[PDB]
Design a protein around this nucleic acid. Structure first.
Lengths: 136, 194, 197, 172, 191
RNA sequence: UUUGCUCCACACAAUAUAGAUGGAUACGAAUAAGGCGUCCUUGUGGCGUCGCUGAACCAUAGCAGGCUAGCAACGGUGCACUUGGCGGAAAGGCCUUGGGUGCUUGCUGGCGAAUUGCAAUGUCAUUUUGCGUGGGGAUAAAUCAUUUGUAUACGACUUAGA
RNA sequence: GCAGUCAAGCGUUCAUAGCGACAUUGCUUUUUGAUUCUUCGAUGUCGGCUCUUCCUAUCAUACCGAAGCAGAAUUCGGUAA
RNA sequence: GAACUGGCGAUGCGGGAUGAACCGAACGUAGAGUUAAGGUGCCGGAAUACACGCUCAUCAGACACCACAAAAGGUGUUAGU
RNA sequence: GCCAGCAUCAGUUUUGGUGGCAGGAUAAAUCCAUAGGAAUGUAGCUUGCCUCGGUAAGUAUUAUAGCCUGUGG
């Protein structure tokens, strides 16, 4: 007999929390919320990801699940250091999120001949998967 | 809203009711209810078909009824075919009671008692194109007036520049339904009985 | 973007869901709002019933008939306010009003069939949390709509004769998953996720 | 008004044979352009001194930058809005990154809460606070606390299309 | 001003265990259990240890924030009656006509019956709610007592009891007759 | 009263299209929360995980998709027979067995496509009706005139009549 | 014509239960003035009779506050046409 | 009923829903483009744009001329001194 | 004659990209050196709770995180 109170599992905005950006230059790029001005305004920075130091609007940025240790204030070199220590981007492209993105840039970058292949190969596959959908 | 989805009549039909389905009885070949009558040969499979069809669905049974017209003094012969809502328990009981009573009679006393309070409904005695004074209750104008007593004066005001719905005018009086209630019952009679 | 389009009102906003469907329309987009009895509106239940209250007194004097008909029936309502925004009294109008049906509760030739939403017209993204809101459900009742409970039964139903469509579409799609990893490392499936997929 | 630019405008009072070298007046301005500025300029001097766009002239008109823009500062600000009636003074505080928001944000705030305009507000003085605490109004002090953190609940997402397939969501 | 974050602490006493998913609460305990909905409110309940629960409000406008200190007191008032239990004593009062109160049962039902009130031939009938019991306390001339878990069926059942006996067309002050909520406490004594 | 009418067919003529040109692709509930998988005491339970828009998912190669030969598979899907079930809220649809038989782009081939002349929508949908050949079925009312008076200005109503 | 605001006073005693001076802000178009926009190739002038309908600034009837409401009787007030 | 000017009457055009007079701008017949005054959820061509605030109104509010509202009050909420 | 298709030009426009330069405090910054600074004080340390220690609570100026303010380039 214990209480149990679901949870309510949010992503905070705080020093560190790292943000994909969606607008606008940056867009599609990871940055670290450094200071935190108010409810909707925050001071962003991402030297590694090609991102300037900027006071953005917490609508034009989205909170990633990643985060890291980062001290308050810290300037652009100091963020760049904490960045490969925790090694940000290597956790990021490991998630489904960055993969879903890199999947779709790929589908956009497909060529008229490649799109013909993928139908040939999907036809290969339908077959075999339809296979065991009969035995089992 | 209710929507009628069945009609299951009897094998046999008394010829009263048949005649209801004609304007010209004497000239007809009198075909009504001879291909439905078959349907009752087929045990009656096509027949539990619909009764089972009600049971499955349907929130509301209603017996179709008609009157013993020629067993009474009137000059009619064509009976009055009504609709009756049943009020017992369960849908299956209700169609089941009917199934037992197809071509079966039902005398007042299954329905009415002494000391019940009934609600009677009729098309009220008709009178024709009656004047406003009697159709309405409007006061007669004085002896004096020209062009006629038995009218309403102001039919309506300057504006709302149209004669209104809520004034009084000559037309049909009588021949209206009308559901007056609480018509204590004083006697349940039996033909039968000198 | 399709021939038909089955929206499910629920969590809507007459009002907004309102438009979009009139706009559409005038652009050839046969639409078919359902469910509805579960519409919604800004404002504490009370009002609106106040609001309602009027578009009720407004009559015609001289013959209560021939005047502005006050429907009750969620449906109708949505309708109306839809409408108002579609110039009827012309032809292009009308040729518009046809395209659009509407029912409270998903009957048949739709309960099948899929349905969608209209984000930009969802309470739940328009409003701010804390603001009171309605439910054409009540509303309709309350200004007299004999039938809300007959819908609300045929709902209990089809929320099932659905589910059990479901727990069956779902034990399927799952085997297809435990019989879709046997064949894929296959050769066909690595080239593939290079192009993509 | 628009977006601002700090400005330094260093007028004179036209030289005379009589009074050569006629004392030079600096004013930090919070305007849209160098036309503003030279304007917003003379308006204030015709209130302290005996000059005008004539008996004058504008010597310099230098954009000024923030030094540390980057740097989140706490701007107290003082303000003389007129109202509908009399006139009032104020001391608002505005957490922001640079002057040239401290004046923008302010004007929007003095608009919304008090229905004033650019017409009717004099931004008496602006002053980066150095230390917290000299900070005195709860809607700033709220944010200067121990390792601060908060969620962004009820996230609504923004779509382009008309229709959608899912029925959303507001998790975050 | 749009406070950034509030909180309180519901002190969990032992006995009791309060499951919570969404904003359905379930007061499990010694005397029974109790449940409640709060979908209407918008708060984030958060466990720290059996003994403690922190009900927050992130970015609340002042009217949102009073709804945070009520919630707390709402979840306390399902803990309390669930352990110590409530007891809403009621004394009768009368310058002349003696009020006679009884309990009948017509179809289930549990009706307080309230007779000869100011020598009305009327009968006043209150419906006793569920959760709650009615005692005519001996030792105390005249003392109907309502004793449940909740507070927020009891104090009402009582309140109605007190309110079915309002005087009509007299000056309040002469005619002080009626049934009244003198006592409020718990089933358990000492506390 | 000109050998009509009804159902399924197909032949030919027409006559329209508020507007096919791969596919309207089925949980329910809450959003200060849920999905999906999994373990368990079957619970508001533990553990993992996903979203961050369908840019998805299904179908999709063959003269507008031809005639043909094999290899690998025992699957996919069209078309028509039939077993058994579900559904009435407008059911007028959905699933499933057992066959009869095509096409199979699952991998490999071989013939043909031209001159529609450098583009011309380059016509392959689905509306309703009419006229005849040919395969099953059925074999009536109503109106007037006459008549009644529970009806009635007249029409209407109500009855009567081999 | 019907209503507000302050409150010198009245109301035994106490400004406001009920009233309310000096002041002052309104609404209304059932008074009457002012005006002369419409009509002088005509809009049938008064009042009564008759008959619908609307307004509420409610006399009565329903349910409640308030009193200088002990009960009876009566006064102010609400939602109400 | 006077003064200064500009209008209308003698003047369409787009805009104020509608309207001599207000805002735009003053006209040969047509073609492209740009705007004015007004606007851009839908009637309706055009952002259910972006940004920061205030407001829940058991009679909300909504844009100059213009088709109204005041004095006086509110521990309803927001900044202030 | 009728109806269009492309090309390369004219006239008038519209909608994009991309670079070279000239200013500004010869942008300001960040970055490197060089001085001062503080706290919502990181580490060490000390004190008290407390499941073998991490919370606190101090203290304190870069140390086993960094932060601000200026000079010079």
């Amino acid at each position: 007999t214990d209480s149990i109170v679901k949870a309510s599992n949010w992503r905070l905005v705080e020093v560190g929390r790292v943000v994909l950006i969606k607008k606008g230059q940056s867009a599609g790029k990871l940055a670290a919320i450094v200071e935190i001005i108010d409810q909707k305004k925050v001071l962003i920075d991402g030297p590694k990801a090609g991102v300037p130091r900027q006071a953005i609007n917490l609508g034009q940025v989205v909170l990633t699940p990643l985060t890291f240790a980062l001290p308050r204030g810290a300037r652009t070199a100091t963020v760049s250091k904490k960045w490969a220590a925790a090694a940000v981007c290597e956790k990021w492209a490991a998630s489904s999120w960055a993969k879903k993105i890199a999947q779709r840039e790929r589908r956009a970058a497909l060529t008229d001949f490649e799109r013909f292949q993928v139908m040939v190969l999907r036809k290969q596959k339908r077959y075999t998967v339809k296979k065991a959908l009969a035995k089992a | 809203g209710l929507r009628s989805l069945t009609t299951v009549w009897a094998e046999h039909l008394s010829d009263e009711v048949k005649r209801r389905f004609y304007k010209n009885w004497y000239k007809s070949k009198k075909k009504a209810f001879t291909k439905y009558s078959a349907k009752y040969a087929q045990d009656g499979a096509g027949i539990e078909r619909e009764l089972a069809r009600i049971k499955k669905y349907a929130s509301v049974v209603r017996v179709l009824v008609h009157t013993q017209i020629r067993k009474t003094p009137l000059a009619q012969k064509k009976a009055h075919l009504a609709e009756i809502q049943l009020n017992g328990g369960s849908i299956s009981e209700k169609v089941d009671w009917a199934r037992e009573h197809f071509e079966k009679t039902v005398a007042v006393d299954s329905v009415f008692e002494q000391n019940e309070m009934i609600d009677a409904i009729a098309v009220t005695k008709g009178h024709g194109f009656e004047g406003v004074t009697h159709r309405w209750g409007t006061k007669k104008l004085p002896r004096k007036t020209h062009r006629g007593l038995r009218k309403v004066a102001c039919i309506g005001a300057w504006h709302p520049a149209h004669v209104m719905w809520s004034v009084a005018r000559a037309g049909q009086r009588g021949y209206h339904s009308r559901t007056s209630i609480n018509h204590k019952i004083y006697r349940v009679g039996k033909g039968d009985d000198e | 973007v399709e021939p038909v389009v089955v929206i499910d009102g629920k969590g809507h906003l007459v009002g907004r869901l309102a438009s979009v469907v009139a706009k559409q329309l005038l652009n050839g987009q046969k639409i078919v709002v359902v469910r509805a009895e579960e519409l919604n509106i800004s404002g504490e239940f009370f009002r609106n019933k106040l609001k309602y209250h009027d578009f009720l007194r407004k009559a015609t004097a001289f013959n209560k008939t021939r005047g502005p008909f006050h429907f009750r029936a969620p449906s109708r309502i949505f309708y109306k306010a839809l409408r108002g925004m579609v110039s009827h009294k012309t032809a292009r109008g009308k040729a518009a009003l046809e395209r659009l049906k509407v029912f409270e509760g998903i009957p048949p030739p739709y309960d099948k069939k899929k349905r969608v939403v209209v984000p930009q017209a969802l309470r739940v993204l328009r409003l701010k949390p804390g603001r009171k809101y309605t439910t054409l459900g009540k509303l309709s009742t309350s200004v007299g709509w004999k039938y809300e409970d007959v819908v609300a039964k045929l709902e209990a139903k089809r929320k099932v004769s659905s589910a059990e469509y479901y727990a069956k579409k779902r034990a399927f799609t799952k085997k297809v998953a435990s019989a879709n990893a046997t064949a894929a490392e296959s050769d066909v499936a690595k080239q593939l996720a290079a192009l993509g997929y | 008004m628009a977006h601002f630019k700090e400005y330094q405008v260093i007028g004179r009072r036209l030289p005379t044979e009589s009074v050569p070298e006629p004392k030079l007046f600096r004013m930090r301005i919070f305007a849209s352009n160098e036309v503003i500025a030279k304007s917003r300029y003379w308006y204030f001097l015709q209130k302290l001194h005996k000059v005008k766009k004539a008996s004058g002239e504008i010597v310099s008109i230098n954009q000024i930058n923030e030094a540390h823009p980057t740097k989140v500062k706490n701007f107290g600000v003082w303000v003389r809005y007129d109202s509908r009636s009399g006139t009032h003074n104020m001391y608002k505080e505005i957490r922001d990154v640079s002057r040239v928001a401290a004046v923008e944000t302010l004007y929007q705030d003095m608009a919304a809460r008090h229905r004033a305009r650019f017409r009717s507000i004099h931004i008496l003085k602006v002053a980066e606070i150095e230390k917290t605490a000299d900070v005195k109004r709860q809607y700033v002090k709220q944010f200067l606390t121990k390792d601060l953190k908060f969620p962004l609940p009820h996230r609504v997402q923004k779509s382009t299309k008309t229709f959608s397939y899912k029925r959303p969501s507001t998790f975050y | 001003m749009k406070y950034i974050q509030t909180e309180q602490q519901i002190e969990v006493p032992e006995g009791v265990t309060v499951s919570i998913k969404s904003r359905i609460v379930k007061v499990v305990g010694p005397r029974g259990t109790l449940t409640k909905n709060l979908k209407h409110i918008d708060v984030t309940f958060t466990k720290v240890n059996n003994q403690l629960i922190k009900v927050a409000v992130h970015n609340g406008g002042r009217k949102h924030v009073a709804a945070l200190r009520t919630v707390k007191s709402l979840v306390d008032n399902m803990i309390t009656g669930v352990t110590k239990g409530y007891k809403y004593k009621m004394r009768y009062v009368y310058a002349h006509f003696p009020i006679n109160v009884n309990i009948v049962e017509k179809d289930g039902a549990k009706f307080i019956e309230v007779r000869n009130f100011l020598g009305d031939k009327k009968i006043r009938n209150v419906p006793v709610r569920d959760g709650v019991t009615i005692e005519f306390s001996t030792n105390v001339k005249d003392e109907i007592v309502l004793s449940g878990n909740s507070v927020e069926d009891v104090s009402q059942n009582a309140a109605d009891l007190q309110q079915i006996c309002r005087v009509r067309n007299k000056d309040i002050r002469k005619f002080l007759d009626g049934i009244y909520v003198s006592h409020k406490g718990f089933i358990t004594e000492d506390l």
